[PDB]
Amino acid sequence: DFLPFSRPAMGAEELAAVKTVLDSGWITTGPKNQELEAAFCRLTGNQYAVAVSSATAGMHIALMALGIGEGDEVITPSMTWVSTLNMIVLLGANPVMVDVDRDTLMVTPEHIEAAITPQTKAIIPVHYAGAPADLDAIYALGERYGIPVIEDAAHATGTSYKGRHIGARGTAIFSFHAIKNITCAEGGIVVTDNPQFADKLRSLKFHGLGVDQAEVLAPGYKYNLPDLNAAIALAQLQKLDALNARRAAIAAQYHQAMADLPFQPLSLPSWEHIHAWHLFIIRVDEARCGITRDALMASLKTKGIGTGLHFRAAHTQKYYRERFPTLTLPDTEWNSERICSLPLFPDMTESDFDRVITALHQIA
Numbered sequence: 001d002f003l004p005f006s007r008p009a010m011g012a013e014e015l016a017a018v019k020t021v022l023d024s025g026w027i028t029t030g031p032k033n034q035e036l037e038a039a040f041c042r043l044t045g046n047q048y049a050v051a052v053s054s055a056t057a058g059m060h061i062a063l064m065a066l067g068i069g070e071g072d073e074v075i076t077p078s079m080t081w082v083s084t085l086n087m088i089v090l091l092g093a094n095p096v097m098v099d100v101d102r103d104t105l106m107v108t109p110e111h112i113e114a115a116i117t118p119q120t121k122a123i124i125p126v127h128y129a130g131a132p133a134d135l136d137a138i139y140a141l142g143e144r145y146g147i148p149v150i151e152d153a154a155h156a157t158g159t160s161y162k163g164r165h166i167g168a169r170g171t172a173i174f175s176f177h178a179i180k181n182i183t184c185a186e187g188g189i190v191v192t193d194n195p196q197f198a199d200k201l202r203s204l205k206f207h208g209l210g211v212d213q214a215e216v217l218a219p220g221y222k223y224n225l226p227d228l229n230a231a232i233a234l235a236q237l238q239k240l241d242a243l244n245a246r247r248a249a250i251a252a253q254y255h256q257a258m259a260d261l262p263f264q265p266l267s268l269p270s271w272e273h274i275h276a277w278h279l280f281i282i283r284v285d286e287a288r289c290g291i292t293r294d295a296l297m298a299s300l301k302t303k304g305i306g307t308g309l310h311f312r313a314a315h316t317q318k319y320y321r322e323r324f325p326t327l328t329l330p331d332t333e334w335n336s337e338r339i340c341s342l343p344l345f346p347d348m349t350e351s352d353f354d355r356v357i358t359a360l361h362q363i364a
C-alpha cells in the first residue's frame with residue numbers, strides 16, 4: 001500500500017464542476033476563469049488577478065511585463081524551484097542567487113540588500129512551505145531602492161503575514177499544481193494591485209492580443225487556463241479552510257512526534273503569521289541521526305512511504321553549477337543536502353500518519 005508524500009483532495013465537487021463545464025460547451029477560457037480571478041481578489045484583498053496555465057507561466061509573464069531582459073539582474077534565493085531561475089535566464093537576464101535563513105529556508109532582508117546593484121530589476125522572495133517571508137522588511141527594501149517585489153506564493157494559498165493574507169498588496173503568484181494546497185492539476189494565478197501591470201499580464205498570457213477587435217499589440221505567449229481546469233480550482237478554493245486545517249492538524253502530530261526523534265523540522269518564522277502547511281520538511285543530518293537524508297528517503301521507500309525533496313538548490317544543478325562555478329551559499333547548501341518532505345495531504349489518515357512515524361523510529 002504505497003503512501004505517497006502528497007495526494008490531491010479530489011471529491012464529488014471537482015467532478016460536478018467539470019461536468020457543468022463539459023455540458024455547457026465552453027471548455028476553454030471564459031466565465032470560470034473570470035470567477036476564479038474575482039474569487040482570488042476576494043480571498044486576498046487585492047484588486048486584480050490574472051489566471052494562467054501554471055505558476056511558472058505567471059512568473060514568466062510577470063518578469064516579462066516588468067521589461068526584464070539582457071543586462072538586468074533579478075535577486076532570488078537558490079533555495080526554490082528551478083522554474084524561477086529558468087524564467088530569469090530565458091528572458092536574457094542574470095539571476096543573482098542569495099542565501100536563506102538556516103532554519104526557515106527564507107530569503108533574509110540582509111542577503112537581499114547586500115546583492116542589490118543598479119542593475120537589480122526585481123526581487124523574488126519565496127513564502128517557504130506555507131510560512132511567509134519578512135514582507136515589511138522586503139517591501140521597505142523594494143521602496144527604498146525602487147525595485148519591484150514579485151512574491152513567489154506557490155506554497156502559500158492560505159498563508160497570512162501579520163494579520164494580512166499573502167497577496168493582499170503587491171504582486172503574488174499562486175500555484176494550482178497537483179500537490180499544492182488547492183489544485184486543478186496544473187494552473188496558477190497572478191494577483192496584483194497595479195492595473196497597468198494586470199493589463200500587460202492578461203495580454204502576455206494570450207498571444208499579446210489586445211484592443212488598440214483584438215490584434216497583436218506586442219508578441220506574447222500562450223498561457224491561458226481552460227475553464228475546465230478553472231472550475232476544479234474554484235471547487236477546491238471553496239474547501240480551502242477545511243483542507244488547510246487537515247494539513248495543520250497533521251503538522252501538529254508531526255511536531256509532537258518529532259520531540260522523540262532526531263530529525264529537525266524547520267523553524268517557524270518569528271513574525272506573526274498563519275501557516276498553510278504546504279509541506280512538512282525535516283532535516284536529516286547524518287551525524288545527529290546516524291542516517292543520511294538520501295538513505296532515509298531510500299529507507300522510507302522500502303516501507304512503501306514516499307517522500308519529497310524541496311529543494312535540491314538551484315545553484316547545485318548542472319546548468320547553474322557550470323554558469324556560476326564560484327557561487328557559494330552555505331545555509332542553502334547545508335539544508336539542500338539534508339532536507340526532505342514527509343507525507344502531508346488533506347486525506348492522509350492516522351493509519352498513514354502513524355505508519356510514517358513507526359517507520360522513522362525503525363530508522364532512527
Ligand SMILES: Cc1ncc(COP(=O)(O)O)c(CN[C@H]2CONC2=O)c1O
Pocket residue numbers: 054055056057080081083084126152154155174175176177179180187188310
Ligand atoms: C516554490 C515554487 N515556485 C514555483 C513552482 C512552480 O509552480 P507551478 O507548478 O504551478 O508552475 C513550484 C512547484 N510546485 C510544487 C508542488 O510540489 N512541490 C513543488 O515544488 C514551487 O515549489
